[model samples]
Target: SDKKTLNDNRSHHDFTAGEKINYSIETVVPWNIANKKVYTITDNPSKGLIMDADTIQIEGLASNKYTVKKNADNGFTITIPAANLAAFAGKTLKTTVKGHLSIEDLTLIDTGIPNKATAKVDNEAHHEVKSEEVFTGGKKFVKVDGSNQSKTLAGAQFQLVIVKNGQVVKYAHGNEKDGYTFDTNNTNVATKTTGENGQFEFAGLKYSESLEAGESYAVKEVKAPTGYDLLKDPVLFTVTKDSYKTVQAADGQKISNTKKGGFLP
Candidate 1:
């Protein structure tokens, strides 16, 4: 008789949308059953998760010992035939799959993503294991007139800054139309400008249940709207698990800028 067990795991409990996530699957084969000479493993990831078939890596076995097949539904399967199973006896086989959380629809951030893996020995199917659900979120803000809250301000440029341990760790570079990316190697700051809608969003941000120590996001006005003064200080905000629920312009934080001249014509 043989005892086989499977487990699925992930690299992080929470990650940013559009960021790569590594999924690990482990199969322990205590002993090979006389008749069960073949092994198959399948992984199924929920929607909002995109898997990269080319990034599959295996351990405890030779590269040619197993074959991988990608399913139409974005899932994948690994098969080890009788010929290759002999070498894996009494050893634990591990596979690592790399994928990214999709940011196509920001709403998906609220629900998070889940993944599962199952195993089969010859013709008999074993129980399936699920990885921990991972969450991602974003933040939005409305640029408004300081005197009139109902009035929206446009043509305002803002830059993003990431702080950790009370020190600036990363700065973003790029624009809203082209999208933004972060880097810690250089100090070149990027700005996102508000259009007619007077709104800007920092998307694909990692979410945490509580305000973790030594990490936060801040935005400063690089250029104020015409006739408006720059903000005295940058606005700071945190991305939480429910951040998606308040990402709408109406629910976003209101960043107001005062007019430059005191007298109005």
Candidate 2:
């Protein structure tokens, strides 16, 4: 037989399928960004708030290249340091916890695998007051001209209220018929003044995971524009999924009824 051509000529690259990939994980509370390196306070001894000595973990992770350690204060810290996490300040990170696994193990599974992780931190908790809205899910309340429908009226003041059991709660009354009310504390009312566009948009409304889908609110016009009329009654609204709506009033009537009630302007 004739000699085979200069042997088999082929070029190929190889990958190590069984080798584990590198991963790093860290844990940090939704810390404050105003100050530099603000450490979370653990156990002041006034209370039994000691941190449990436990290793940090990542759910759904399948590798052996990670490690966990305790803080110098014996606090329940994990993975990375505050210095490393500070770089991601103001950024939100979502991570999961896992026990262990491998790519080969996952290949043979016909069902969804569940992972678990535990965290026990002896840190302080923070609460807040909403000075303003700053994120998504903004809702709009427009001031319109009752004399001329669909025409926006400017300079009117609108306030937000939470209603329950057919009566207004968490807000003060006595400004009735003018279209708006105030918070019970006598502090500044959670109200906004319509700009030239005749609209007052409430922005940065927080998302409540525990709230029902039908949580409702009312926007009442407290002060009329220099000339136009304020909303005679509070307008009801709700946030559904990704959108907000101005539904009928809680009493099953429109905010602007053609008769009996106050004008819609």
lDDT agreement of model 1 with the native: 0.71
After aligning candidate 1 to the native by TM-score, how far in Å is the CA of 220 from where it should be? 2.7
- lDDT per residue for candidate 2 within 1-265, as digits (tens), equals 0010111122211111111112122333445533443333221110111223342334433224224444443233243234444444554332322111122221212122221122222343333111110111325555655545456555677676665566455553322112223345534666777665565644323222212344346676787776544556677765332332332112122133121235476
Encode model 1's per-residue lDDT on 1-265: one tens digit a residue: 2122222243445666555677777766547643477788887877766667777777867668788899865778888875676666777677788766665665675675777778788887777776667676677888988889778888998888876766667787753223446678545686678987788877666764333576678887889898898887778887776775655766678888898965567
**lDDT agreement with native, every candidate:** 0.71, 0.36
Query: Pick by lDDT: which candidate is best?
Result: 1
Runs of candidate 2 exceeding 4 Å displacement: 1-136, 171-186, 206-215, 244-265
- Cα deviation at 160, candidate 1, in Å, is 2.6
**Model 2: worst 10 consecutive residues (lDDT sum):** 1-10
In the order shown, what is each candidate's alpha-carbon RMSD? 5.0, 22.1
